[PDB]
Design a protein around this nucleic acid. Structure first.
Ligand code: ZN
Length: 40
DNA sequence: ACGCC
């Protein structure tokens, strides 16, 4: 019962911790299928 | 924030 780990487990999304996706698949995170590099 | 690998 790790109350200290209130969020950000392995189960849940690292980025935004929403619904049932993950930080691999996060729609908030700019995973644009076009090279979403810190440049363009 | 990845990754749960
Ligand atoms: Zn997310």
């Amino acid at each position: 019962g790790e109350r200290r780990r209130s969020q950000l487990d392995r189960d849940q999304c690292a980025y935004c911790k929403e619904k049932g996706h993950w930080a691999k698949d996060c729609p908030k995170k700019p995973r644009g299928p076009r090279g979403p590099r810190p440049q363009t």
